[PDB]
């Protein structure tokens, strides 16, 4: 497509939904409204940044999925927050 050969497969909306997947996968947020909190805003910003970075890094859509899922895995493996998150 435009920025990558695979680009046309993944529009902003899917990027947004994937960013949400990052947020919930890292931090299974109780309520969408909670995303307004500055703490969450930072995590949202992080997830956007990371997703963008992965998009530009990924030679192929499959890779984009892989290194994202891997990154999530690393986050939980390292930071292991899933259930704690709230705190």
């Amino acid at each position: 497509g435009v920025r990558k050969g695979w680009h046309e497969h993944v529009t902003q909306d899917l990027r947004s939904h994937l960013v949400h997947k990052l947020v919930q996968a890292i931090f299974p947020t109780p309520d969408p409204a909670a995303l307004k909190d500055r703490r969450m805003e930072n995590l949202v910003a992080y997830a956007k940044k990371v997703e963008g970075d992965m998009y530009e890094s990924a030679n192929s859509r499959d890779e984009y999925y892989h290194l994202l899922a891997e990154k999530i895995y690393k986050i939980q493996k390292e930071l292991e927050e899933k259930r704690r998150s709230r705190l």
Partner: peptide
């Protein structure tokens, strides 16, 4: 463990499939 690995991984991967599946609303 393995189940958790695959769930956490799959959660991300699922998205496009879920979306194109839910071609309704």
């Amino acid at each position: 463990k393995e189940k958790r690995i695959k769930e956490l991984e799959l959660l991300l991967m699922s998205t496009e499939n879920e979306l194109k599946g839910q071609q309704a609303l």
